[PDB]
């Protein structure tokens, strides 16, 4: 069980947990309540495991994409800030933390990856991915490499894959759906093939992870890396004269990073919901609260308007905003964990030779789309089975009759959502949004 009369907070090990502990100490000084900041490994997976049993932290920090799944599992408490508080943050950050009409977390900061380059090795960074192979050859003759970045997490490689591939998701009929060719298209295959070719030509290594790439850039061994705002502190400490800029284009197309909104959710099992709200609204989401976290590890473009205006003149933040505008806001639907596993497996498999790029992305697409579509059908089934009104029921039955995919018993008109074409299912969802019923 969770201890009453104190706050336990989990946040990822790459964020400013020491700066957040300083906000916790300020809360403790004023209220008497102790705040403990922890950074367990794999916390995005640890949280749904421990919170399912009524345990875990009072507050969980992560990008908004995982929160829809936590909320669907009943693991988050609904947050209730008043209009005055909501007006303090940008409206699009509230949209990122809204799930089924309800606010399920407080947005903190907007994150996007950027190209980070060492100005003493490369005063002019490449504008295209295409010019990176020759640039690497030129740097290898001087004992350096062109680029090193985490190849193990799809968050870092997706920008290149989606440059000519486009967005993986679309918003339709009140929900995010994964596109039928959002992962499997010709542009995405071209991007992943470019990445695999960089590996085969010895310009990158398939086993390069986060620590390896961070250590190489911070030691001046590689001219470029791909990372988010949290990484800038370790670069400052290493004294690399660095620049933060737009990611390289592929086939003239901008790289499209997935944009995450670092958010704070309150565990549904917490006996300290009111203290958590006070801490988040009155201590963290203030200029002084965000500065303490930001000075430890930069947050990026913060959700709080007053503090964002103070950091707007930072060229590194303008680069973050530029890359975020070229990218895609992550959906928060529960199948996001299956989408990430699918893309992770595809990149690893293509880089190692286990699968061809075409087969890797074809399999990622079917795995992510089958899980996302099944979740949508589970929800549509739940919604249809509560309807009672004659006119609405008759119209759904009419739409099914047109297809002939139904059977009749002595007492019911039956149909399986899995036997319908996706076009009929979209007609059902489209009609249901007009019915006024949810």
């Amino acid at each position: 069980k969770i201890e009453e009369g104190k706050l336990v907070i989990w946040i990822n090990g790459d964020k400013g947990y020491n700066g957040l502990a300083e906000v916790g100490k300020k809360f403790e000084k004023d209220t008497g309540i102790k705040v403990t900041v922890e950074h367990p490994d794999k916390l995005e997976e640890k949280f749904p495991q421990v919170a399912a049993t009524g345990d875990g932290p009072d507050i969980i920090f992560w990008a908004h994409d995982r929160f829809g799944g936590y909320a669907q599992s009943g693991l988050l408490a609904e947050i209730t800030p008043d209009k005055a508080f909501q007006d303090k943050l940008y409206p699009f950050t509230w949209d990122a933390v809204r799930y089924n009409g309800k606010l399920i977390a407080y947005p903190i900061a907007v994150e996007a990856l950027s190209l980070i380059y060492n100005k003493d090795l490369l005063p002019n960074p490449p504008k295209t991915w295409e010019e990176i192979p020759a640039l690497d050859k030129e740097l290898k003759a001087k004992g350096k490499s062109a680029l090193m970045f985490n190849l193990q997490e799809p968050y870092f490689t997706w920008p290149l894959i989606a440059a000519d591939g486009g967005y993986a998701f679309k918003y339709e009929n009140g929900k995010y759906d994964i596109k039928d060719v959002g992962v499997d298209n010709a542009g995405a295959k071209a991007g992943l093939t470019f990445l695999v070719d960089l590996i085969k030509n010895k310009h990158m290594n398939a086993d390069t992870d986060y620590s390896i790439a961070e250590a190489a850039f911070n030691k001046g061994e590689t001219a470029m890396t791909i990372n988010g705002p949290w990484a800038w502190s370790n670069i400052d400490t290493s004294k690399v004269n660095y620049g933060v800029t737009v990611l390289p284009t592929f086939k003239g197309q901008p790289s499209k990073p997935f944009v995450g909104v670092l958010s704070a959710g309150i565990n549904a099992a917490s006996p300290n919901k009111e203290l958590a709200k006070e801490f988040l609204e009155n201590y963290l989401l203030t200029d002084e609260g965000l500065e303490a976290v930001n000075k430890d590890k930069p947050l990026g473009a913060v959700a709080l308007k007053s503090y964002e205006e103070e950091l707007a003149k930072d060229p590194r933040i303008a680069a973050t905003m530029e890359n975020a505008q070229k990218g895609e806001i992550m959906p928060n639907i529960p199948c996001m964990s299956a989408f990430w596993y699918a893309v992770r497996t595809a990149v690893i498999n293509a880089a190692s030779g286990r699968q061809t790029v075409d087969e890797a992305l074809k399999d990622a697409q079917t795995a992510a789309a089958d899980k996302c579509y099944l979740d949508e059908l589970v929800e549509l089934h739940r919604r249809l089975m509560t309807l009672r009104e004659r006119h609405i029921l008759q119209q759904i039955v009419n739409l099914i009759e047109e297809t002939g995919h139904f059977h009749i018993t002595n007492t019911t008109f039956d149909f399986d959502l899995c036997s319908l074409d996706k076009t009929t299912v979209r007609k059902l969802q489209s009609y249901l949004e007009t019915s006024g019923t949810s």
Partner: peptide, 5 residues
Amino acid sequence: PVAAP
């Protein structure tokens, strides 16, 4: 599986 009256 949907069943309607």
